[PDB]
Amino acid sequence: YRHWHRMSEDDWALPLDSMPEDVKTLMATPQTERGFVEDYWYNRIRGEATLLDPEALPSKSYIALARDMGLQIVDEPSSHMMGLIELYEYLRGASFVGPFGTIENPVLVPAVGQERVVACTGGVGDEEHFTLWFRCREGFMYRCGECDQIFMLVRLYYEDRYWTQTLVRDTFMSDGDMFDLKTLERVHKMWNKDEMVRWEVGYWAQDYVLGKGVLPGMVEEHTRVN
Amino acid sequence: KSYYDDFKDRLKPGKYTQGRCPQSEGDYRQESKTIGREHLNDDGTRSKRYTVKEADALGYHYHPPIDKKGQVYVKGPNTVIERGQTWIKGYELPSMEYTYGPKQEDIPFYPRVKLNVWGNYNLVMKVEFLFFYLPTIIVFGICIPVYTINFAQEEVIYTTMTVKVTGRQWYWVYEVESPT
Amino acid sequence: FYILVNNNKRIGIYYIKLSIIIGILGIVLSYIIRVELYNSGNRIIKYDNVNYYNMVITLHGLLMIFYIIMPGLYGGIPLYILPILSVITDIVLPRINNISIIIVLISYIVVINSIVIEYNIGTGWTLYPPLSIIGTVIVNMILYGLIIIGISSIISAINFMNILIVIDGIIYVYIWSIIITSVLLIISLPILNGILLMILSDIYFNSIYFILNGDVVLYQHLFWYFGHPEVYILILPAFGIISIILSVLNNKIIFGMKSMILAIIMISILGSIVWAHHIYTVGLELDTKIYFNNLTLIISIPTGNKIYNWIILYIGSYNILYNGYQSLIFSIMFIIIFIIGGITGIIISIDIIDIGLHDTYYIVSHFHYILSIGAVISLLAGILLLKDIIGYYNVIIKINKYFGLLLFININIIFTPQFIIGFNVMPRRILEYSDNIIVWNLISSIGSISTILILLSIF
Amino acid sequence: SWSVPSLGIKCDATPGRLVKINTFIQREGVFYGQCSELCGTLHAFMPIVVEAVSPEAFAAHAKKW
Amino acid sequence: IYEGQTVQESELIPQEDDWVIEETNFCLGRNCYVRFREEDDLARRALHQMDSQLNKMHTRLRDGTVIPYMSFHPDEMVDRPAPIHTFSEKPLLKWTWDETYEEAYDD
Amino acid sequence: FELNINIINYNYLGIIITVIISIYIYNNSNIISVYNSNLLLININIWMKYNILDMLNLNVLDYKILLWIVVIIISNEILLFVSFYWIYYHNYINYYHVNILILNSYNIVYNNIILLTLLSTIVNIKFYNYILSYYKYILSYLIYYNNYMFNNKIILEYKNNSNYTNDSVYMTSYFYIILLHYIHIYDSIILIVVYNYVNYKNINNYYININIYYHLIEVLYIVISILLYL
Amino acid sequence: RIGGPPVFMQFPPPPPKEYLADGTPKTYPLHQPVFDHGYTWEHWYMTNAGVFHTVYYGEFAK
Amino acid sequence: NLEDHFDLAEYMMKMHNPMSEYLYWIAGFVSGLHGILPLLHSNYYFSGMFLPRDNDNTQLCDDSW
Numbered sequence A: 001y002r003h004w005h006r007m008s009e010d011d012w013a014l015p016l017d018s019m020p021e022d023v024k025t026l027m028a029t030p031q032t033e034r035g036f037v038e039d040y041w042y043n044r045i046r047g048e049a050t051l052l053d054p055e056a057l058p059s060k061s062y063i064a065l066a067r068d069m070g071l072q073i074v075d076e077p078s079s080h081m082m083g084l085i086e087l088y089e090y091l092r093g094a095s096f097v098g099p100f101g102t103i104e105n106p107v108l109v110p111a112v113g114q115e116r117v118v119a120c121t122g123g124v125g126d127e128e129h130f131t132l133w134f135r136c137r138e139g140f141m142y143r144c145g146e147c148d149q150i151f152m153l154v155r156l157y158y159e160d161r162y163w164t165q166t167l168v169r170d171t172f173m174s175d176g177d178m179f180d181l182k183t184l185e186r187v188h189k190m191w192n193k194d195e196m197v198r199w200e201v202g203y204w205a206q207d208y209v210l211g212k213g214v215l216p217g218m219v220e221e222h223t224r225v226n
Numbered sequence B: 001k002s003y004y005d006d007f008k009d010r011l012k013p014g015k016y017t018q019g020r021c022p023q024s025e026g027d028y029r030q031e032s033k034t035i036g037r038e039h040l041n042d043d044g045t046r047s048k049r050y051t052v053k054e055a056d057a058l059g060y061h062y063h064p065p066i067d068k069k070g071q072v073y074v075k076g077p078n079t080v081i082e083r084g085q086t087w088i089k090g091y092e093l094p095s096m097e098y099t100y101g102p103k104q105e106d107i108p109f110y111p112r113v114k115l116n117v118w119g120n121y122n123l124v125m126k127v128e129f130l131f132f133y134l135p136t137i138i139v140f141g142i143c144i145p146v147y148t149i150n151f152a153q154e155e156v157i158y159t160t161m162t163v164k165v166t167g168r169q170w171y172w173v174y175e176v177e178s179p180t
Numbered sequence C: 001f002y003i004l005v006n007n008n009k010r011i012g013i014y015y016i017k018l019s020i021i022i023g024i025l026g027i028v029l030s031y032i033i034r035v036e037l038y039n040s041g042n043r044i045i046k047y048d049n050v051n052y053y054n055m056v057i058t059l060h061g062l063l064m065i066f067y068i069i070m071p072g073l074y075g076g077i078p079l080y081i082l083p084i085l086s087v088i089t090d091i092v093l094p095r096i097n098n099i100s101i102i103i104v105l106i107s108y109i110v111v112i113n114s115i116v117i118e119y120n121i122g123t124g125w126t127l128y129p130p131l132s133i134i135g136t137v138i139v140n141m142i143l144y145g146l147i148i149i150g151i152s153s154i155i156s157a158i159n160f161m162n163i164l165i166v167i168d169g170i171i172y173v174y175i176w177s178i179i180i181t182s183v184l185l186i187i188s189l190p191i192l193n194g195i196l197l198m199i200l201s202d203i204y205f206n207s208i209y210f211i212l213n214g215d216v217v218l219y220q221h222l223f224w225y226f227g228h229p230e231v232y233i234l235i236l237p238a239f240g241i242i243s244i245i246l247s248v249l250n251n252k253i254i255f256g257m258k259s260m261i262l263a264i265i266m267i268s269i270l271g272s273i274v275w276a277h278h279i280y281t282v283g284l285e286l287d288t289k290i291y292f293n294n295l296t297l298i299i300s301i302p303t304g305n306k307i308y309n310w311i312i313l314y315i316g317s318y319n320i321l322y323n324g325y326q327s328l329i330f331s332i333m334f335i336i337i338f339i340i341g342g343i344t345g346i347i348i349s350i351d352i353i354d355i356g357l358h359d360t361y362y363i364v365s366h367f368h369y370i371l372s373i374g375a376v377i378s379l380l381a382g383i384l385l386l387k388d389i390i391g392y393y394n395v396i397i398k399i400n401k402y403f404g405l406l407l408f409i410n411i412n413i414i415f416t417p418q419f420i421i422g423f424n425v426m427p428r429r430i431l432e433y434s435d436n437i438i439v440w441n442l443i444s445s446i447g448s449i450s451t452i453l454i455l456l457s458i459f
Numbered sequence D: 001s002w003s004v005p006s007l008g009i010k011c012d013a014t015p016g017r018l019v020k021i022n023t024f025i026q027r028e029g030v031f032y033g034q035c036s037e038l039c040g041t042l043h044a045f046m047p048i049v050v051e052a053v054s055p056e057a058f059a060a061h062a063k064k065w
Numbered sequence E: 001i002y003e004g005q006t007v008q009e010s011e012l013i014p015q016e017d018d019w020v021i022e023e024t025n026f027c028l029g030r031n032c033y034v035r036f037r038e039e040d041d042l043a044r045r046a047l048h049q050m051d052s053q054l055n056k057m058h059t060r061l062r063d064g065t066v067i068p069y070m071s072f073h074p075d076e077m078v079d080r081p082a083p084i085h086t087f088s089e090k091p092l093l094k095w096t097w098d099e100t101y102e103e104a105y106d107d
Numbered sequence F: 001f002e003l004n005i006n007i008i009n010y011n012y013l014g015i016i017i018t019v020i021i022s023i024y025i026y027n028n029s030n031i032i033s034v035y036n037s038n039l040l041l042i043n044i045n046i047w048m049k050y051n052i053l054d055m056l057n058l059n060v061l062d063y064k065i066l067l068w069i070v071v072i073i074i075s076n077e078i079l080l081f082v083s084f085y086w087i088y089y090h091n092y093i094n095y096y097h098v099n100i101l102i103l104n105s106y107n108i109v110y111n112n113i114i115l116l117t118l119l120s121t122i123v124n125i126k127f128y129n130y131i132l133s134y135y136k137y138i139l140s141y142l143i144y145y146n147n148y149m150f151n152n153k154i155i156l157e158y159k160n161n162s163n164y165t166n167d168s169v170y171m172t173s174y175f176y177i178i179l180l181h182y183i184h185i186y187d188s189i190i191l192i193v194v195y196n197y198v199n200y201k202n203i204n205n206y207y208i209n210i211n212i213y214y215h216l217i218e219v220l221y222i223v224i225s226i227l228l229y230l
Numbered sequence G: 001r002i003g004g005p006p007v008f009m010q011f012p013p014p015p016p017k018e019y020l021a022d023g024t025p026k027t028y029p030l031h032q033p034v035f036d037h038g039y040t041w042e043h044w045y046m047t048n049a050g051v052f053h054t055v056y057y058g059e060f061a062k
Numbered sequence H: 001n002l003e004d005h006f007d008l009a010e011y012m013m014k015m016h017n018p019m020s021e022y023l024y025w026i027a028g029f030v031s032g033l034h035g036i037l038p039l040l041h042s043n044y045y046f047s048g049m050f051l052p053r054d055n056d057n058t059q060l061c062d063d064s065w
């Protein structure tokens, strides 16, 4: 959005030193129990394990492929929530302009709390009036006293929580078959051999499953000076 | 009727000047020992420790509210499904008698009326023109007089005598040509 | 905390609180002046202590202008509502806002301390040289206060200008009023600082700008190049308040919003180019005098448009609404009073009329009707409108018809007679006067004691 | 500031400026004025008294004084 | 200049011959100084103040919609007295236009 | 969702700085004033640290806000110089026929204009490198040499001038205008001594501020040179 | 922005209420005096309650 | 917290200690004294009296008191 500042380096990828060292437990943790860093590396390890196995991709369904990469198959419930989330974020630093509100289609006023201050400017052209500010509280269909424009408050609330991308992913995504560490090892040997590492994440991940320091050059990789 | 008599009972006249006993009879300056009131004084005011000496904005009692999933507790709406539709019942504020005291009866009638706007665009535009140009005319009526009177002060006159006047602290010196 | 707070609304309260405190000292000085002027003779100041009177009038003027009305109308109400009117969480520069109020207090302490410790002499609030530069150290202390005050004013102006970058709604007329005052400060203050530094150079660095072959009239140009913009920096915030009160209380949308805004912009530009109407009697060139007289009379046009737009706001309002609220009465009283002050301003604007009326009590009454009556009442009306939002109590003002009536009557008893003695004529900045001017001076003095008594009834 | 209200004169006595003021008195009398620029402690104690007499009287006065 | 919303004669035609203008009182009620209970502490007096806000009040019309407390300026939209942090969720100024895009509709 | 602004709730530098200012007034020794100036520098630097630490908010409008403040400040610097030019020209009618020696139009103006121009070229190269995410170590030391020569030349001029401030308003205005320029030159030293390469690059308000200020001071000297020397 | 100042937070419940040893609710200082005198007048004023509403504000002698 | 919602919560909820108000009024009273006390001190310093007697700088009748 225009109100956001510049992408960080982390916005693209995370450093491999932030990979959890207990990979064996990481790949067995349920999604609802994974933190932001743990969830990043669960998806990256599992997603790259399937993508770096070309011979199996054509026989893998899009439902299974999306699960491996950690992408959520969309549906009307989740689409509604995500859309209203992105609409809330956009309105943080953007103007609020849209069609005239009526009983059939009230002006939708997203909010996290139970109230949001709103102003009615009336219709277009000569039907526009001076700003009339009012407090839009949930559970009431508001009508402007001047132009009769109907307003309504929409709350981004779900089960004692507000709506977030993390909440939407946890509520609607279902964990599939438990990730098999044999796949990690098999793909690891595929792209990492004879001092050539073409899957750096899988070389670090396999090292942790082995106990940290087992694979060649990994003790030297983990030895820091400050 | 007298509306004050309705809520007279709630208003019990006070005993202490400024509503506090002498500090000797009760030390309101100390923090309350009641569980869950460590941030309050005995008289109910916020304790200096909570607000000044150990203010959280200064790094004391560091306790991040947001949880691991980036969530905070949010209270949901009063939802009531009905007629094949999910409804939300809004929270209505309590009767103003509870909060203010007067009994909400015999309220004078103030009808709904849309904003009192001035109409007749053509007429309004002419008035606004007059609001600006009637003063402009008056100024123009003063302009010519102002020029003339200014010119009059600064007129080369055939003066025949000179008096020099010097102002000093605190008296006026006068120099005049003496008759020959 | 108390001093560390950065909350813009708390700081707004501090500005009003400090203006009232410093205002007590201001009013006391005014009572001294009026008591002295009750008859001819010495009443409360000895003839050997006439220097004290000169200091009383000097400090009265300086404190009321820079430490009371300006901190109240440009620092108090603005810091409390402007970020709300702009639908923004808080002021753009939080830390700067805190230091500004602290600076004002510190400069006030310096001034009053200089009363106690230094020899008491006066040179007017206009600090004309060479008199200002041949005085004692009290003049040096006053200069430090003004320069320090200037720092607070400029940084506060920078703070308000930044609202344009963050405003999330519509720039209402009141917001426009503050922005333009901020612009007027950014352009006028740097010139004031320069001339004040030159006063210091002559006082403290053996400079010779204000001794022969150096033109003393130079100071008056640079001073008044800030002086008159100052009187509009003090009135424009009041105009902004009047607009909000009339629209809100009458439930009527502002009429000619764009003309109101463009009238404020116009007053500022014109107010930046008319300063020499304060220098009519020095002996300027005929064409200069005519230019300044002409442009000074033009300021009435934009000022007149605003007055008439206010009148139509009150016209036609519903009768059922109670009209005795103190805020509404004060707002209406402002229109009635400001017209008197402005019209007399136009009279003095004619230079030939001004020759007779310069340095007379007619000028006093003119700027009192606008400031001591109009600006004060506007600040009161604005605070009164925000009583619920601010939340103060323990006063009987909100609905007090006695206070409004007594104030209006008695304030006019003080300054209406000062117009009369202007054609008598009684010079300004004097304490002794001829016995044939006692009647009017006595009447005004009776008015001053009475107004003070009415200030006690609010509690 | 040299001020004589009856003669319509109010001229600032500024150091460095020798301001010219022209006048034409029409009636005899004594016209009283006061300094009109705060000038220090005794700003209120330097009045301006001008007496206008007939030209024949002025000549006799000037010859003697 | 603003002169109200434009009305077409068709919109002024009633569906019944007995329709008149609804007589609903828009006086919110009788009020005075907010009166706190002595028993209430600082926290509970704060709740009391929050429940006495006129700008949270409205008038319900015959069709169930409510006309809220409205003001020309947002100064009257914060709790009285003003809290330390007022507009946490940015107040939304709603502008209206005739532009539309197809994605918003479904056939 | 987060708040649009991370509000700053408390600050104590303001009290200290305001007290430091009072010490300048309430003192009986000029040594106290010297050490007080150091205290001011320290606490103004803390305020600058607060500005750098506000970068953690990732607010897009912060750069714009600070940039426009500098614009206002530059404007105030320009208007202060205008007031001195005004003071100078008001008494113009009493210049050039008094028994004083005004300055030559050959030596001082040329070497100074040539010197200050080189200062601009260095700052311009710094800006160019700033655009190219590059650094050249020698640049800052060229500025130090330029400032040293400027200080060396101005000191000798004042000491060898045979007319004093009390001789004429012409001399007072000459000395004061030149001093005012020097003070702004010294403020440029205060700013430039911290120049370094920061890896956040063009979201750093320091770089744009330095470029604007240096150009202002050099341009101001062109106006002074025409008024006084030429 | 994950982990930034929340747009909205619910108030925590108020601290436990205090009773006296006899069960009387503990009262706290209150600057709303009931002045003693013989006057009982009640003045009511229609007041602006925004744009489309009013409130009947009453002032009581006590 | 609910106690922190309102700025100056104790005062707004009408629980503040009255001493805060007393200090504010005292501060204003002290500010006023800065105009009266130096008046008395300066009068005595240059005259020997704290305050004059009306018209004691002018000629008075024998029975004047």
Ligand SMILES: CCCCCCCCCCCCCCCCCC(=O)OC[C@H](COP(=O)([O-])OCC(O)COP(=O)([O-])OC[C@@H](COC(=O)CCCCCCCCCCCCCCCCC)OC(=O)CCCCCCCCCCCCCCCCC)OC(=O)CCCCCCCCCCCCCCCCC
Binding pocket: C002, C013, C016, C017, C020, C021, C023, C024, C383, C390, C392, C393, C394, C395, C397, C455, C458, C459, H008, H009, H010, H011, H016, H017, H019, H020, H021, H022, H023, H024, H025, H026, H027, H028, H029, H030
């Ligand atoms: C123009 C006038 C008329 C106007 C009429 C129209 C008005 C319209 C309405 C205007 C409304 C504006 C907006 C209002 C918003 C109010 C918000 C508010 O209340 O904020 C809460 C704020 C604080 O409440 P809080 O939140 O509970 O604060 C708790 C504290 O922070 C913490 O509590 P704590 O207890 O820990 O506090 C610390 C406390 C600790 O305090 C203590 O321990 C005090 C101990 C007792 C001391 C008592 C004084 C002793 C004096 C002795 C003198 C001896 C002289 C001997 C002479 C001998 C001669 C032979 O204080 C300190 O430690 C520092 C105190 C510093 C400030 C006081 C300075 C006094 C003057 C000093 C002068 C020094 C001169 C030196 C010269 C040296 C030269 C060498 O309230 C106040 O500060 C009080 C405000 C009260 C008035 C509000 C407005 C009411 C409506 C207007 C009424 C009319 C007023 C007229 C002006 C005054 C006339 C006199």
Ligand code: HEA
Binding pocket: B134, B135, B136, B138, B139, C126, C231, C232, C234, C235, C277, C278, C296, C297, C299, C300, C301, C303, C304, C305, C307, C338, C339, C341, C342, C343, C345, C346, C348, C349, C350, C354, C357, C358, C359, C363, C367, C370, C371
């Ligand atoms: C906020 C305060 C304030 C305001 C608004 C004004 C406004 C004006 N003032 Fe000012 N003035 C002062 C404060 C103020 N003044 C002070 C403090 C001094 C003395 C300082 C000192 O000397 O120490 C002073 C001195 C002063 C003098 C000096 C007289 C002298 O030194 O002898 C003059 C003369 O030109 C003058 C003129 C004006 C004019 C022409 C206006 C105009 O703004 C007035 C405009 C308003 C109207 C004209 C009325 C409303 C308009 C209409 C009703 C439209 C119809 C009217 C017409 C068509 C004319 N003022």
Ligand code: HEA
Binding pocket: C016, C019, C020, C023, C026, C027, C030, C031, C033, C034, C057, C058, C060, C061, C062, C064, C065, C068, C069, C072, C124, C125, C126, C364, C368, C371, C372, C373, C375, C376, C379, C380, C411, C414, C428, C429, C430, C431, C448, C451, C452
């Ligand atoms: C806005 C500034 C202001 C204000 C309010 C006043 C108010 C008053 N002034 Fe004013 N006065 C000046 C500014 C002001 N004056 C100036 C600038 C001069 C010229 C200085 C000079 O000659 O060098 C002057 C000169 C001056 C003299 C001339 C003395 C002389 O030089 O010979 C006299 C007495 O005749 C006088 C009397 C009064 C009186 C009796 C009041 C008032 O007391 C009338 C009664 C009104 C009130 C008592 C209410 C005031 C209340 C407040 C100001 C507080 C408001 C705060 C809030 C609302 C939060 N004043």
Ligand code: CUA
Binding pocket: B167, D001, D035, D036, D037, D038, D039, D040, D042, D043, D044, D046
């Ligand atoms: Cu001389 Cu006044």
Ligand SMILES: [O-][O-]
Binding pocket: C227, C228, C231
């Ligand atoms: O000053 O008008």
Ligand SMILES: [Cu+2]
Binding pocket: C227, C228, C231, C274, C275, C277, C278
């Ligand atoms: Cu003016």
Ligand SMILES: [K+]
Binding pocket: C036, C037, C038, C039, C040, C041, C042, C043, C431, C432, C433
């Ligand atoms: K007298």
Ligand SMILES: [Mg+2]
Binding pocket: C358, C359, D036, D037
């Ligand atoms: Mg004068």
Ligand SMILES: [Zn+2]
Binding pocket: A120, A121, A122, A123, A129, A132, A144, A145, A146, A147, A148, A149
């Ligand atoms: Zn509408």
